[model samples]
Target: DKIHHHHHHENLYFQGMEIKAMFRDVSLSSRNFSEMLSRESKVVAALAAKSPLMAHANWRLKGNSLEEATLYPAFDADGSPSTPALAVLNEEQRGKKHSASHAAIWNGNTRPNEGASMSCHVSDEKVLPDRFSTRLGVPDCYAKSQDLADVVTTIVAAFNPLVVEASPEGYFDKQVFDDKPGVGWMLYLPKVITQQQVPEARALIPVSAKGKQTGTIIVSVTDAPFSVDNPEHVAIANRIEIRLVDQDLLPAYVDI
Candidate 1:
C-alpha cells in the first residue's frame, strides 16, 4: 500500500458527478451560458446547505485555460475578482461540431485539498450537446456522521442528472464489478421507474425537478458504510447491476 498525506484519503469516501449534455452550441454571452452558471451557483448553495466544508470554498482558479488560469481569493473579504467561477474559453476554441475545453476547481474546509473538493468542466456541445458537468467528493467520516440520504437526495434533486452515483472510492472498479457495471451504493436515474426496473435497494426515493416528479433514486445498502473490501457489499452491488442492465435502467456500456 502507498501513503496519501490527506486524512480523508484514509477514510472511505463517496463522490458524485453529473453531466448534462447540451443539445446545441451557444456563445459565452448567450442565455445558455448564463443559465449554466446560475445552476452551478445553485448547486454550490445546495451543497453548502449540507456542510460547512462546501459552504466555505474561498479560493478559485479561473482562466481560458488551466495552464493560463489565475488563482485568487473568491470572496469580498479577500478582494473579490470579477471572474466567474467557471471560465469561458477563448472564441478560437469554441466549436460548432466539436468539443471546447472548460474547467474550474475549488476546495473546502480547513485547507485546500484537505477536506472536501469540488470541480466543474464542460465542452462545446456541437455534434454532441455541449456538456455541463460538476462533481463533489467527501470522506465518509464526514458523510456517515451526518444525514447521508439528505445529502445525496439534495444533489440528485438539484442536478436532475442523466446518471449519478455515490459510493466508497473504488466501489465501481473493474476488479470489483468484473463484467457487471454495478450501480454503486446509490444511483440516480432521471426517468420514471417501475418497481421491476429497480433491484433490491435500501430505498427508492422519488426525485423531483421543477416541481415535477422526474425520476427515481436507488440506495443499495443500509446498516453500514459500503466497504470495497467487503464481499457482502460487493454482492449487493453486483445484484443491483444485473437487474439494472436487464431492465434497461442502466446501459451495459456507456459511450465515452
Candidate 2:
C-alpha cells in the first residue's frame, strides 16, 4: 500500500488497481516511454474528463445528453484493463421512437477541434499520498495528451505533474500547480453488459471485446472504446509517450 516508497514504480502502481494480461502486449517503447502509460487509458477517464459523455453533459460544449449516456452510462465495470466487461448503447429505444446514441474513448491517432482534456491518473482518495481517499489520494498527469479532446477521447501519458504532496490531507496549490496532472485512476472489474455496448456495434467488432466469448479474432477494440459508433474510432494509430502522475512531481503506469 505504500505506493510512494516504491523505487521506480511510484507512478504505475497504487491502491485499488489490478492489471490484466490481454491488453498488456499493447505497449510503447520509444524516445518517450511514459506516453503509453495509464493516464487516459480507462473508460472512466473518457466518461468523466473531457469525453463526449461530459462534453455532451455541459451546455457550452458539444452538449448532448443522449450522447453522454451512450458512451458512458451510470454503469459499473469489471475485468482486466484490455478486456473490460463494458456494454454500450449506440441506439436507444424511446416510447415507441428510437434514436442513435454515442459513446467513445480516446486513441493516440485522432485529434479534436480544440484538443482533448489533458487527462491523468487518479486515486480514489479524498486527498493525496495516503494512496486512497474518496478524493485526496489522486494525482494528475505531469505530461499531457495531444490535447484535452485528444487526451480524454484517448489514452496517453503525463510528463511531470505539478501537484504532489508528502502527506495526506494536503491541498494542491493552484497558484503554482493544480490537480491537472493525470490523477491516479481507480480500476474496477468491468461488468457484463447485457445490452448494446456500442450503437450499431453488434456486428463490427466481436463479442469478446464486450466481455463475451467469441470464436474469432477478426476485429480488435484495443485502439478506441466506441469505434463501432463513430468513424473517428476506426483510426489505427499507435504512439509511445509518457506522463508523470505520482512521483516527485514526475510519475508513470503499466501496459494493458
Candidate 3:
C-alpha cells in the first residue's frame, strides 16, 4: 500500500505500520558505537623522530601487545606529546650497552630496525581513501569528523547533491522530488539521448528497502528512472540527480 500509493499519489505508501508498531523503542546500530571507530592500541605503531602525520590523538601501544619494550615519548615544556613523537630506548649496539636509539623501530627493541617509509599528511581538502591506499600501497589517513550529530546532519542535509552516496533505503522515495523519472509531470524524460559525454542513459532509483516486506521478501520499487534523459538533448551526466537510487531497492541482478 505504501509503495503503490507513493507511485500513484492516491493513498498512503508501503511503509509498514506493522513494522513501526513492532519496534522496541530503538533501532539496531550498525556496530556497538565504540567499534565504529578504531580503538586498538596496536593500531598506532610506535614511531620515532619522523612524523606519521596521523590524526591527533593519545594512543597507547603498551595498552596492547604490539610492543613490550620500555619506551618514552618526547615531552614539551608543557609535558604534552611532541608533534613528531620522538621516542628513544636504550638497546644493544656495536658491543655497547644501553646505547641511545631514535627511530621507528618498534618491532623489536634489542634488535630494533626501521621499516619501509611512505607517509602522507592530513588536511581538510584532501584525504587518502581506501581505494588509492591499496593501489599505491602506502599508509594514509582518513579520519572523518568526530561528532555524531554532525554525521547525522551531514546525511540529512544535501548541501551538495552530487558529492556523496548516503542515507537509508526508502527514506526519500515518495517526496515528489525534482529531476526524477516518476515525476514526469514536472519534467518529461526521453527514450534515448547519446553523445560524447553520455554514451548511456537508463538509471535506477529505488526508494524502498526491507521493512514490512520481511527478511525473505524484497521491497519493490517501481519508480526507478530506467529511461533516458529528461530534457532529451542533454547528456546523461547532467541527469546526475536522477540516477541516484536507493541501493536497497531490488532488481539488481549480478552474474556472480
Instruction: Identify the candidate with maximal lDDT.
Output: 1
Order of the predicted models by lDDT, top scorer first: 1, 2, 3
CA error at residue 198 for candidate 3, angstroms: 7.8
Winner of 2 and 3 under TM-score: 2
lDDT of 2: 0.22
Worst 10 residues of 2 by lDDT: 236-245
> Model 2, clash count?
68
TM per candidate comes to: 0.65, 0.18, 0.16
lDDT of 2 at 81: 26
In terms of lDDT, the poorest run of 10 residues in model 1 is: 1-10
Which window of 10 residues has the lowest lDDT sum in candidate 3? Answer: 129-138
Model 1, residue 39: what's the lDDT?
Answer: 44
The whole-model C-alpha lDDT of candidate 3 against the native structure comes to 0.21
Quantify all predictions' global Cα lDDT against the true fold: 0.48, 0.22, 0.21
Give lDDT: candidate 1, residue 190: 67
Off by over 4 Å in 3: 1-31, 39-237, 243-256
Local accuracy of candidate 1 as per-residue lDDT tens digits, 1-256: 1011122232333443222222233443232333444444555565667766665344343333333333432332322222443233334235544333333334323332343333333443333333443344433444451255555555565444455556655665722334433456666666776666664766677777788877776776676666667787777777777777667667432332
